[PDB]
Each structure stands twice: as C-alpha cells, then as structure tokens.
Amino acid sequence: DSNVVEPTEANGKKSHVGPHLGSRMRIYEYSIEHNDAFWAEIARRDFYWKTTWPDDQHVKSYNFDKSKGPIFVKWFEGAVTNVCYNALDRHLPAHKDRVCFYFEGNDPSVTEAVTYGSMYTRVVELANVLKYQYGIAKGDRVGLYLPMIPFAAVAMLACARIGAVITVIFGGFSAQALSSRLKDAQTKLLITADASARGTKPIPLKDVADEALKECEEEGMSIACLVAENMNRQSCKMKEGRDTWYGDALARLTPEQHEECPVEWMDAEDVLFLLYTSGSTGKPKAIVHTTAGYMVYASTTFMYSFDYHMDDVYFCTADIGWITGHSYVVYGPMIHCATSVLFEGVPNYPDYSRWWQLVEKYKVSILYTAPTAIRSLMQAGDDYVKVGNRSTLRVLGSVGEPINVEAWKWLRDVGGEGHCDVSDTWWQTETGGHMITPMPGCTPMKPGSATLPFFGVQPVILDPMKLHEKQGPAEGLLAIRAPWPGMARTIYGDHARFEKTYFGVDGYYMTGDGARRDSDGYYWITGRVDDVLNVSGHRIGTSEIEDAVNTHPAVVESAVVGFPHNIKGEGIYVFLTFRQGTEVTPELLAAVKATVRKVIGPLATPDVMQVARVGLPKTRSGKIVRRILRKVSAGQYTELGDTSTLANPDVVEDLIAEHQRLCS
Ligand SMILES: CCOP(=O)(O)OC[C@H]1O[C@@H](n2cnc3c(N)ncnc32)[C@H](O)[C@@H]1O
C-alpha cells in the first residue's frame, strides 16, 4: 500500500530480528506455535535466575474462562530471581564505568553522569537504610512521591532488592490523591524529596507530602517519611520523629553498608509493585504486577521494540508515576544495561529546544515519547527542532494515545530527519509491556498504526454485536485471547473486580479499547470504548473527577465526558448542578475547577463547565444517562438516542441550548 514506510536499510542490518518482515513473522509464528519453548529460551538467555522453573514445556499456566474457575495466570512458577540483581548487580563489575543515566535537572546547570557502579553504591546504601533503619521487610509497601532524578531509580531498585512492594505516586498528584493511594496500599514508609521544579514553577513535594501525611494520620495511620535532598533543604518543613533527611540516614550507615546489602531472592509470583490506575468504574484501583513474568516481558519488549544494542543511547520522556516510566525508564532499560538520559525537567524550559539539546549532547539514538508532547513540539514550530543535531537518532517511539499521520510524519521526517524508524507502541498498565508495535529494521510502518502483535501476543477483534471473533479486516473490540508474561495478575484486594472488568467475555482479556485490523493484519487503535479519558497522555476516570466536583459545597451532582482537544487529545467536559439558591458566577465555576485540582491535581483540570440548570439527565433510579451528555458536548443534538427512561425529560432542551452558547 502507498502509505507504507519501509524500514531504513541501516536499521535492517542492525536488527536483532532481521532485515525483512519475513524474519519477524518467522519468530512470531514460533512464539505462538511453540509458546512455552519460546519464553523458556528468552528467559534463560537474557536473565539471571537463582533457580529456574522445572519444565521448559510448561512455563505458564492459566485460565481465561470464568466458567472453568477463577481467572489466573502464572509464569515461571518455581523460578527464583530478583529484579534489582538483573538490573544492576549482574552487570558488575564489568560495566562499572558504563553510564547508566546521563542526568540533567530542570535547571540546565545541574548535570551528573551516573555509572552502573555508582548506581550499585547508591542502591545498597538506600536498601540498608530501608532494612536496618526503617525495618522494611519483604512484602511491605513503600510509597514513592519523587521527581525524575537518580534517587527515583535508586528507590525503585532498593525496594526490589529487599522484596518490598513499591507504589509510585506521580508527583503531579495533589495531597489528597497521594493520601488516598497511601491509605489503600497501607504503606509503612513514604520516600519523597524536598522539592523539584517544572520550568519556572516550584514543585514543593515534601510540603504536599506533609498535607497527605496529616490526612493519613487523622485516619489512624503511622507513616514514616524519608526525604531526598534534591534542592537546598529550605523549601520544606520536617516533623521531628517522623521525617528524616536522607543525608542523615546515610551518615548512620556503617562502612560495610556502603558496599554490600543482601539480595532477597524472590519467587516468580511475588508482588513487585502496585500501580493505581483509572478505570471505567469507580476510583483508581491498584493493578498488581509480580516478579518473573513482568521482568521478562518489560525487558524483552524494550530490547525488540526499540532494537536496543549496547552502543545505543536511549531517552524515554515518561514519568515513573505511570507504567511507561516503570517498564521503559527504570526496569527494562537497566535490565538490558542501557545507557539512558534521565531528565527532571520539561520540554519547554529554558525553551522548546531543550529535548533536542539533550539528544545532541548525549548522542541519543532512541527517543521514546508521547503524542501530547509531539503535538506541543509541532505547535512550537520546526525551528526549535532544527537548531539541534539529530544525526544520531535512528529509532523514535510513541506511546499512550493515537497519533495522526501529520504528527507521525513530523516526528519521523522533521524530528528524525527522515532517517528513523518509528515504533508506535500500543499497550496498557494491565499488560506490563508493549503488545502491538513495530520493530526497527524489519517492520514496514503505516503512519497511525501500531502494526503487528509482539512475540507471544494473540490479539483479536471481537464483534461488538455478538462478541465472537471477527475474521478478515474488521473493526470492533480489541481483546487478547491467550496469556503473555507481563499480564497484571489481579487488582489489589479485589480479584472479583479484576474478573468483572477484564474477563466479562469468557476466554479473553478485554482491553477496553476498540481497534480496526486491516487487510495486512495491521492494527489501528481507535481509543477507549468505556468511560476512560486520555487527557494530555494521562489515563483518568470520570468517577474520580465527578466525585471531586461533587465535594464542592454548592454542587449537588455532576457528570464528566471527554471531547476532542487539539493539544490535550481529549479534554474534560463537566456538566454539573448546583444547590437550589446558588448564585452562579464565574468565581463559583473557578472554585469548582480549583476543587478538582485540589482533590486530584492539575492533570484533571476541567476544560469546560456547563451548568445543568434543571438537572442532569437521569433514569427513575437515579442513573445518569451519559450518552446524552456525550452527544451534547460535541454539538450532535439530533443523535442522542432514546430518553424515555428520563425522570426529567425537561433537561434535554436546556443542555443543547447552553452548549450552543458556550460553544465548548
Ligand atoms: C501505556 C500507557 O498505559 P495506560 O496509562 O494504562 O493507558 C492505556 C491506554 O492508552 C491508550 N494507548 C496506549 N498506547 C496507545 C497507542 N500506541 N495508540 C493508541 N492508544 C494508545 C489506549 O486507550 C490504552 O488502553
């Protein structure tokens, strides 16, 4: 087809897979027809095992059919390993002077080249602080509320070393969102930093943590706090007895505790991390990832989707508060001994050339970013890109949202000067790593398509009418019909909800996305089919936004829908009703918007607020009829469907008239 972009010749010669699509298809076919042998070989080849699984022909067991019993998957049962050991110790001392992170702060005067040897020292130091000053034991939960600095990777790996369970809270979340996650995870310890900065704006991490910790204590929790010195100590307060500066904890270490810390050898299905993730229903829930399968899957996808070789220099722009930073900043890259760029700042400070200054300075060859960022760079204009030397780039990656042809072409042919392959990687928190993706050198690309499934992955298109598999070119519900090593194993404390959310169609993992498969077998992701939003690349649920809106004292109820937004991809549209007698003013609407930002964070800011004067559209039971609100927010006033269940049909006329006025 004419929209196909061939892989570059040079990448084809370098590829771990081969120079032609036939090479990929040969491996893919093997990974399905001989699935256990495939993963056994990869696992043995590329990872360290203290103990291996007993049988190469049965490295997985599973059930995807609720009628046969509980849903479950297990990978490498019987094997024993450690993620920190694979990320760090095993590379030493051979690679002690190899750079692990080229770190730069938000402030371009702040830089450090952190070697693998230095990471080892930093990690054994912190692990010993955790074990012997905080008494952190295997299985204990530790919360992280950190900026993108070396200490963030150190903290993740130190917890893995001792078998603690991390839960990472994105630094953009508010105190209330942080507290909620610490409460649900029952963290014994919060690791944070004094402060960071986003361009010109200070980010007062410990000050926010103080409010979250006060809220947790008022509910009876006792959470200690360890604070890294990222700035000058003078942005935050410290509570005697609860809060410790990391430098003070370091000083208490014995000399030996700077050189060695025992490794906790983990069983395959021991929990590695909990990641709170927005869903179609209810508040964010903790997705559970275990040890052996996730380790293998995050690392193997990193290697093949980006074709990482030891002479490559890798830069992913994601934060550790989201799954992309787990799999594709810290765990996967370090397990394959990558040299990476670690960047605390933002793409527009000091100006929109910053990421390209990083690419040139560190000779980056693989850049993994997101369409929201790409759209913002495009809007800033090509001259911010072209002042940078991009000759070293050979692979560009995109994650988290659909990317249109114009942005894809701009990424490759302006950003990458037309000498790069592009890996548009589709996957989710629940899948651990990439699921549908190009591979450099061997995969013809279609701009806008994720292309072909990763090795071992069997996607299907389910018919939205009767929910069976569709053959041939087809559009419908995206599902996965067989297990893969990186699959999340449960929702923390609520396996019933896990089965209900993802396994409602027996035999399939239901993604929540829709997709079209074309006549070449390439997949085109068309977005969520449930109520989940994708706002500036952040996955957010309508329920926490509505719950946040409803905490404003004047608000009776609300309903949130998404709408197309040029920069954010999807914006947040709020319909809401106020108590009888409320004076509706611009200041009131501003206070409701600020309430959402207080309860959740800036990432959930409403873009439009429409006052439903008579009420939200609702059935006799009280159920808000959301399709009505969806159609209105788009201007489509004739395609609403049926309203006969509306206890208050008077509401409709008001909703269309108001929208025409606001003109979103
Ligand atoms: C890794 C982030 O994982 P999550 O934060 O859990 O968001 C997962 C959700 O992002 C969306 N998505 C992710 N990658 C793509 C892509 N390449 N093209 C289109 N849409 C994408 C999709 O809707 C999915 O279900």
Task: Compute, in angstroms, the gap from residue 400 CA to the centroid of ligand 1.
Answer: 4
Angle at 184 between CA 179 and CA 188, to 5 degrees: 75
- Cα–Cα dist 174/582, whole Å: 28
Place of tokens 């108001």: 658
Residues of the chain with CATH 3.40.50.980: 86-264
* Cβ of residue 319 lying under 6 Å from some atom of ligand 1: no
Residues of the chain with CATH 3.30.300.30: 532-662
Task: Compute, in angstroms, the gap from residue 458 CA to the centroid of ligand 1.
Answer: 17
Task: Compute, in angstroms, the gap from residue 406 CA to the centroid of ligand 1.
Answer: 19
- The annotation status of 517 as a binding-site residue, yes or no, is no
- Phi and psi (nearest 5°) for 23? -65, -45
CA distances from 46 to 153, 297, 310, 314, 489 (A): 21, 11, 14, 19, 23
Which is nearest to 630 in space by CA: 564, 536, 563?
563
- The annotation status of 277 as a binding-site residue, yes or no, is no
Residues of the chain with CATH 3.40.50.12780: 22-32+293-528
* Cβ of residue 536 lying under 6 Å from some atom of ligand 1: no
Task: Compute, in angstroms, the gap from residue 658 CA to the centroid of ligand 1.
Answer: 33
Please, which residues bridge with residue 201 across strands?
198
Tokens of 223: 């959470």
- Cα–Cα dist 282/212, whole Å: 21
* Cβ of residue 501 lying under 6 Å from some atom of ligand 1: no
Substitution candidate for ligand 1 out of 426, 523, 528 with most atoms within 8 A of CB: 426
Element (H or E) spanning 295, and its range? helix 292-305
| Protein residue closest via CA to atom 10 of ligand 1 | 400
CA distances from 211 to 174, 206, 236 (A): 9, 9, 12
* Cβ of residue 512 lying under 6 Å from some atom of ligand 1: yes
Angle at 315 between CA 311 and CA 321, to 5 degrees: 140
Return the half-sphere exposure (C-beta side, CA atoms, 13 A cut-off) of residue 266. 30
- The annotation status of 198 as a binding-site residue, yes or no, is yes
Assign domain 86-264 one CATH number from 3.30.1330.60, 3.30.420.40, 3.40.50.980, 1.10.3720.10.
Answer: 3.40.50.980
Resolution (A): 1.5
Place of tokens 């949202």: 401
Substitution candidate for ligand 1 out of 525, 526, 533, 540 with most atoms within 8 A of CB: 525
Classify residue 89 by its DSSP letter.
Answer: G
Return the half-sphere exposure (C-beta side, CA atoms, 13 A cut-off) of residue 71. 27
Q: Are 165 and 272 in contact (CB under 8 A)?
A: yes
Tokens of 552: 């404003």
Strands 243-245 and 555-565 come out as unpaired
- Cα–Cα dist 525/461, whole Å: 11
Substitution candidate for ligand 1 out of 289, 451, 539 with most atoms within 8 A of CB: 539
Assign domain 22-32+293-528 one CATH number from 3.40.50.12780, 3.40.50.720, 3.40.50.150, 2.60.120.10.
Answer: 3.40.50.12780
| Protein residue closest via CA to atom 20 of ligand 1 | 401
Element (H or E) spanning 162, and its range? helix 150-162
Q: What is the CATH number of domain 532-662?
A: 3.30.300.30
Return the half-sphere exposure (C-beta side, CA atoms, 13 A cut-off) of residue 254. 7
SS3 assignment, position 410: helix
CA distances from 626 to 532, 617, 629 (A): 13, 8, 5
Q: Are 335 and 87 in contact (CB under 8 A)?
A: yes
Q: How was this structure determined?
A: X-ray
- Cα–Cα dist 437/306, whole Å: 10
* Cβ of residue 368 lying under 6 Å from some atom of ligand 1: no
